[PDB]
Amino acid sequence: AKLVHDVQKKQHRERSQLTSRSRYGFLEKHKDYVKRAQDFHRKQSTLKV
Amino acid sequence: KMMKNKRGGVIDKR
Amino acid sequence: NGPSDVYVPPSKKTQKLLRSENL
Amino acid sequence: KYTTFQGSQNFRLRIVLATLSGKPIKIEKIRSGDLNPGLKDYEVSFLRLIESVTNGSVIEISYTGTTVIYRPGIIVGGASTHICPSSKPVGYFVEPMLYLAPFSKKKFSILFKGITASHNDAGIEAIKWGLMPVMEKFGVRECALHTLKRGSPPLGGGEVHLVVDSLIAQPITMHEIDRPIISSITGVAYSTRVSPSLVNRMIDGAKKVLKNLQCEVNITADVWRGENSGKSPGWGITLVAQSKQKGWSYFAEDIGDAGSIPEELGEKVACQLLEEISKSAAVGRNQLPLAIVYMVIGKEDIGRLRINKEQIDERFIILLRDIKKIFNTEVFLKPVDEADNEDMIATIKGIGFTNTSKKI
Amino acid sequence: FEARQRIEEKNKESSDYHAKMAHIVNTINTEEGAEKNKYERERKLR
Amino acid sequence: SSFEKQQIEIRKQIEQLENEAVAEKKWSLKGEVKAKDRPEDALLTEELEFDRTAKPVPVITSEVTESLEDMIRRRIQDSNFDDLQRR
Amino acid sequence: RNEHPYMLADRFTDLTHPELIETQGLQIDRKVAIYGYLHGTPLPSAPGTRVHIAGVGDFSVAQIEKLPDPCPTPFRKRLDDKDKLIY
Amino acid sequence: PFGGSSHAKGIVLEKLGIESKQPNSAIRKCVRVQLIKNGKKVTAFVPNDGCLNFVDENDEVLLAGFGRKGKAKGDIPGVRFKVVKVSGVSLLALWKEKKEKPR
Amino acid sequence: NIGKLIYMDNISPEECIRRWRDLEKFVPYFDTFEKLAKKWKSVDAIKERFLTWYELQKAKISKQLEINNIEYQEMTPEQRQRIEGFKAGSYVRIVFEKVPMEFVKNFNPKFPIVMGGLLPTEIKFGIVKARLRRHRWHKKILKTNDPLVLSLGWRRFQTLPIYTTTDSRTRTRMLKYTPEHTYCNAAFYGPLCSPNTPFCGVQIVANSDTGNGFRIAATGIVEEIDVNIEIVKKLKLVGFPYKIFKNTAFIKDMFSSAMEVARFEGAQIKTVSGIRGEIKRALSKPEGHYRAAFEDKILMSDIVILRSWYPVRVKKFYNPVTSLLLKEKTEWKGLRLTGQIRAAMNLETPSNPDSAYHKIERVERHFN
């Protein structure tokens, strides 16, 4: 941090699943999706082999 | 697109 | 007759100006 | 609320100075005692051009058409196009835009579409070579009238791209206490949809009148071939006299019509130019309006410009009366202190103008 | 219709902006790095 | 007086936009609106702006058939044919 | 300050008409003279110049009569106690 | 660089790169300044986009050299100077709110 | 003689020229061509017309100033009244008509009576675009469409600003508060000053509520003036999947009708996982349900999003303070802040229950 304020590089908090849509648990976000997608891709790669 | 950001207009009462 | 007046139209110069050892 | 004018004289200058000053005006009795009374189509389309250029200005034409209410607004510019009517050429609409042109948010890039020339109006070469240098030394530096195609009357069909792109704050204060020495005299002879020999006939007539003065005469020649020629036959001639040490210029133009001899038109425009040189001092009789308009909307200082005796006329002093009627300023004509000629030096203290539309 | 018009005007705007920014970047590069290298060249003589 | 007239009208519109300020928002002035957070088919009257993925399929009108046909005519009168050539 | 004609008011009066106040009855927007020195750029002398009196509203001037200086400066040297004036 | 001095005073013409769509890009934090001594127009940086809204126009800036310690990534090499004051007030102090810029 | 003739404006202009010895027509009046031919057959009449940096700028401006003085040295009622008029240090009386009653009635000489001359710009109203900043010692953040009293030029006036951002210079879209420690843009309906003029802004100007804190709240300069601004607030349309396949899904409720989906066909949507997508066609029997295609298989626990933009308007509200027309001249009260209105009429502050953040804990992610 050379010219950055610590009140500027704050922590944005992430949002939860809506309580009306709560039976489908855990609204998944981009880290969860990439954990899903690269698993699918490595298993499709070994299936293709 | 011509109307979009205008604010005037001639008022032709003829 | 003035065919040279069309031969000296905006071709290059007026076209650009009329808009402003071994061995 | 409204500054009131009468009659349909100086109509473009009234609407232009109302746009500069920001003062609501009324123009009453637009030819009311007439058989077809009211505003004409070319000045109605000029009002449409004002609504294109500005933003938030409300224009309010009456039922009878004989009185107009202009409550001005911010000059914003932008890119546009204007399909002006056949009653007036593109010079009638690009002449009053040269006042409003350097004082807008976005730069003027307009292309007018219609007839190029007229007997009683400004041409492309008139606007360019005469009226652009006086703005060029009043403070703007990037202004250009381009011809993409030109159309002689009556059918026309010529487009003209007016682009000004120096948005100055205010024009500088003029100080021309001299008569500028004419260094050269050049010109342009144009012809569309006719034979290319008429241009050389015009050039030879103008230069055989001009040959006895001991300066240098140079007239450039353009015939217009193809789609760039427009929809009608026409030809014309525009001479300028060029003071090169300061940049001043004095012009005169005309156009020929059905039955006109080109040597006659060339010598007529040459003699009309020499008479403009005679009746001129540091401006022309037609460059004088926007010269003193930029002097009156300069800074809050004194700017002085030399004029001669014969440039004073009913047009010039009705201009001065309209200037004082809108924003309450006077010109002071002091005479020079040497007496081989009658030249005043008009000193105008400019109002405190800035352009407040350009974003900082 | 609005789809085609909005897409092509956005493409035109982006292609204009990239040209404008690249122009000002390498004009600041050329006609001021020439002076930087001229000052370095006449500082190496000292 | 005239200042009393102006002050009455100023405080009238002050009262108006203060209960406007403490009032609820419109549907369009919140992010995250479902179909039932807003009136029925209110987006036909509303003219929203959104980005779109690909250009639509071109409509084939008489102008584009005319342009394509005179392209074909230029090629076919200059014999600009991109055929295969027999080895 | 140096593109604006301003003025601090050291003297104030209403040159209204008291029998006009007796006619209409104290609701009258009444005329006012404001005396003082002015600073900044030259304020123009024509009537109708717009002016903000900072705290009462916007007006336009009606007539200006400039007055001789009530507290003038006189024409190494020292300042005479005769010429140490006060207004 | 400036001749015989270490700093130079200058006049802010216009914030170059004000239409750059990338925050804290070197094109964006980049100001054009007319030096008052010899009249010539140079180009100077500013510490960030956040302190870019302390200069506006004809601001009586003060500018020193830059001193790049290594070939940067998003650089534009060919801008030599950095803005170190504005209207006689250090804009690092302005950026951390220790002073207020007077006009 | 000639200037008095020009500005004596009850006589015709040709009468001015007559007793000294029309602009739609651009080219001026010339003689007949025959008269001009016999006049300019000769040529000899006009043959004599034919043939450091800082100190430099200061020298130019002092040259202009000495030109000003030596050309002012002229007629006395010309200089001292009408060609410049009342330079500085002139003691004047100045008469205003239609001054309010309350000024003369409540004139207390402690409070100064300042007057300033408005320019041609500053009598115009409209949207002023500023860039402003919460003042570093003002405690509370500022809110859009809460009034604050600006001191913009000579005028002090309470207005309703709306703070915007040009998010990487694409929009000018609408914030809901000012930032904590930097500048934002703003736009308020008020009297159009010139650009580059600075201003302060104050929440509270009275003394009954003057509290213990710092009273000046906002600082800024004016960037631009205009008659209209085009600013937007983002609205997203959220809808949920109910039938998912590979690479395509059927999306339930962001629309109420197939006409609405037809209006929005081809638009790019995305899930909250950032999976991009596009809406393709409205389904027939369930009305607002449509078919979208995505980058890959989305889940049943996702929400799709159509980021759109709704235009928002500045509120044309303007009251100048007029503190000198009061009997107290402090204690000026204008529009209240929104927290003050809620505290007055005891409405609780609006709380969306699913807008509040939580402490999300990840379960470990294992696959088959």
Next chain:
Amino acid sequence: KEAHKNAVIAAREGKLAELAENVSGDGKRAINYQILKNKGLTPKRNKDNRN
């Protein structure tokens, strides 16, 4: 519902009252620490660095 409404409204007005009665004894709007010492926008620093 109205009991919870007046409960949260009473908590708001109680907090606002106990905050707004922080007034000094006389009419003297004393300056405070952030205007007095002027330590504008510093990073978090170390107690071990304070000695």
Next chain:
Amino acid sequence: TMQRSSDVNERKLHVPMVDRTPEDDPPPFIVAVVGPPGTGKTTLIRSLVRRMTKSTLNDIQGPITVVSGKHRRLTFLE
């Protein structure tokens, strides 16, 4: 001392602006006495005008313009 001379001669340079204040009869410079309620001001304006004009100006009000120099006069207000 040449580097000192350059770095000192540099800080004479400022933005060249116009003046618009006359040199013949300039206005009285506006002096504003600004204080929180309860310190100086009145006592101070009274003391300054008593020293300047030899006149006990008890019970001030409004702007007060006095001559305090051979060419500098100035206006006191509170």
